[PDB]
């Protein structure tokens with residue numbers, strides 16, 4: 350069975366980078382999947398909210414949890430799967446899909462990957478990335494403006510109204526489920542090294 354590794358942390362905490370550095374340091378076939386690929390398909394009314402940064406994309410229910418549970422279960426079974434592609438500029442699931450063939454190690458990262466216990470128990474290892482809040486926001490702002498075509502004021506408004514409150518209420522609590530907590534994120538090469546060393550040992 351593939352070795353499942355769940356990765357979480359707050360928004361722009363560097364979960365993706367951590368996953369990349371882990372793969373970089375890890376022949377084993379490895380693939381990185383993100384919880385973001387499974388955001389729910391929004392109605393026109395909800396999408397309208399999103400355009401004004403008035404939609405909560407940080408609440409457990411913003412994700413298509415059923416699809417996630419099912420997709421991850423199939424990977425666990427060694428079956429090749431199809432994975433959705435989300436568009437952050439339109440807040441909409443694209444028609445195109447991405448094929449993901451079997452692998453020895455699978456990394457799953459998302460702001461709420463440890464929330465649902467069903468999903469949580471599918472991970473043989475769970476990592477939580479801990480980064481300073483102002484550092485996280487700074488990134489969020491530049492990344493949102495740069496890669497997701499958004500406006501500063503709409504970003505800050507959505508962050509203060511939804512992201513932060515959701516982080517404290519839904520995300521942060523899940524840190525208790527982590528087997529390893531990683532402060533400073535991707536930059537904590539020592540912690541990442543022990544982790545890849547631990548992953549390597551188990552695969553032996």
Ligand SMILES: O=c1ccn([C@@H]2O[C@H](COP(=O)(O)OP(=O)(O)OP(=O)(O)O)[C@@H](O)[C@H]2O)c(=O)[nH]1
Nearest residue numbers: 360361362363364365366406407437440460512
């Ligand atoms: O349509 C959407 C969907 C999601 N989001 C917002 O994206 C946010 C989280 O998605 P992430 O911040 O976790 O991005 P990432 O997977 O690349 O993480 P890092 O590697 O940078 O750590 C959530 O905080 C959600 O509100 C939107 O702004 N719009």
